[PDB]
């Protein structure tokens, strides 16, 4: 195992005060640190810790050249769409996972952080789009959606709509309509020296 003593910045990812919107999801390149995923797996706060292509108890042995941590906020009902091969407004227009995904999808309820009593409209999602997103593609354009024959010309009219809709997050919403913070760890393995490694001493 390579001689690295740094600790991977998982605190700044899972504890950031503000998360990104699902249409503008935030990708973080994690490298040159020792990552210890066992405390992540053994934490009871996470409602979802699905792992694809790896095992959570085995992750402390493999070494990856890069780890990507994509973080965003969705509803409770849309966490089922952050699995490979899924369909829906989130899996088609906001955040797409490839069917060849290798990594962990971590989600937890953030109703105490992202819900405001009067309504938290700071989180948005793309309601309208013409084609499905390619895997790991981000579409942050805010041009008016056509949806009709007449050109939009940048004006929201009858058939011309603003693509982004806003989540209405309130603490009194149901568990399926409450905010959930999702962190998707993608484990990249290229032909480069390994940087992100398990905490094994040798």
């Amino acid at each position, epitope marked *: 195992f390579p001689n690295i003593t740094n600790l991977c910045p998982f605190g700044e990812v899972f504890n950031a*005060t503000r998360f990104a919107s699902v249409y503008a999801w935030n990708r973080k390149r994690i490298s040159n640190c020792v990552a210890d995923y066992s405390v992540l797996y053994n934490s009871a706060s996470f409602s979802t810790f699905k792992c694809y292509g790896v095992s959570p108890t085995k992750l402390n042995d493999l070494c990856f050249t890069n780890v990507y941590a994509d973080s965003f906020v969705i509803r409770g009902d849309e966490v089922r769409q952050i699995a490979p091969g899924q369909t829906g407004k989130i899996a088609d227009y906001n955040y797409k996972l490839p069917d060849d995904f290798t990594g962990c999808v971590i989600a937890w309820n953030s109703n105490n952080l992202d819900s*405001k*009593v009067g309504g938290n409209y700071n989180y948005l999602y793309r309601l309208f789009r013409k084609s499905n997103l390619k895997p790991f593609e981000r579409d942050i354009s805010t041009e008016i959606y056509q949806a009709g024959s007449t050109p939009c010309n940048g004006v929201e009219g009858f058939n011309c709509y603003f693509p982004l809709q806003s989540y209405g997050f309130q603490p009194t919403n149901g568990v399926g309509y409450q905010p959930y913070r999702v962190v998707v760890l993608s484990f990249e393995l290229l032909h480069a020296p390994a940087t992100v490694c398990g905490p094994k001493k040798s």
Partner: antibody, heavy 124, light 107 residues
């Protein structure tokens, strides 16, 4: 360490404009909002506005609308406050407060790290 | 806007005594309240955020409570470094501060 180094004291004349900078260091500049608070000599704190270093967007108090413009320069990681039409009531200590990076509420407004303060005196 | 009212605008207490101040709100701001301490001649310091959570690096004697309209800030035992002005800030809307509470040593 996280620091917000501010510009020096400014003695201005009524009707002029003052620019106050805030050098952010020790953290990623485009990670949290930068709030601008002021304190009249002997009075209490008054929040003026925030600027998002990433997006560049701003929001001000209803009493500072049209008088305060907020700009950031990500190259040197410095936020600026420009106050125009300086009346004698704009004599205060203008603080530059960084928002909260970890924990809290996403919609919340926190002043986690405060600048040293820039005293602005406005008199004829 | 939202008006923040701090009833003990000035309060004297000896070293080692329990101190309590309030931040009665204009509306129901849930627990969207922060507490700041300003030493004489220094920038304010965040002590309590979300009306109950203690900021990291802050002494454990400070404690806040309350929700809705009435909020309470408590110092378990006053110490000589706790002298200053205590402000309460809400973030249910655009941030607004309280009037302030000046702490002086009684003798």
């Amino acid at each position: 360490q996280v620091q917000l180094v501010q510009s020096g004291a400014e003695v201005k004349k009524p009707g002029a404009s003052v620019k106050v900078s805030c050098k952010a260091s020790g953290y990623t500049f485009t990670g949290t909002y930068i709030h601008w608070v002021r304190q009249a000599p002997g009075q209490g704190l008054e929040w003026m506005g925030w600027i998002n270093p990433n997006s560049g967007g701003t929001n001000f108090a209803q009493i500072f609308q049209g008088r305060v413009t907020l700009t950031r320069d990500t190259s040197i990681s410095t936020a600026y406050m420009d106050l125009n039409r300086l009346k004698s009531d704009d004599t205060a200590v203008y603080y530059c407060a960084r928002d909260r990076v970890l924990y809290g509420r996403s919609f919340g407004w926190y002043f986690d790290v405060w600048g040293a303060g820039t005293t602005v005196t406005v008199s004829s | 806007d939202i008006q923040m009212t701090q009833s003990p605008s000035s309060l004297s207490a000896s070293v080692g005594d329990r101190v309590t101040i309030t931040c009665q709100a204009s509306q129901d701001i849930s627990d969207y309240l922060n507490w700041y301490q300003q030493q004489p001649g220094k920038a304010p310091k965040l002590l309590i955020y979300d009306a109950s959570n203690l900021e990291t690096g802050v002494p454990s004697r400070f404690s806040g409570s309350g929700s809705g309209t009435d909020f309470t800030f408590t110092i378990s035992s006053l110490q000589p470094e706790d002298i200053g002005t205590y402000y309460c800030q809400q973030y249910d809307n655009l941030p607004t501060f309280g009037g302030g509470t000046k702490l002086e040593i009684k003798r």
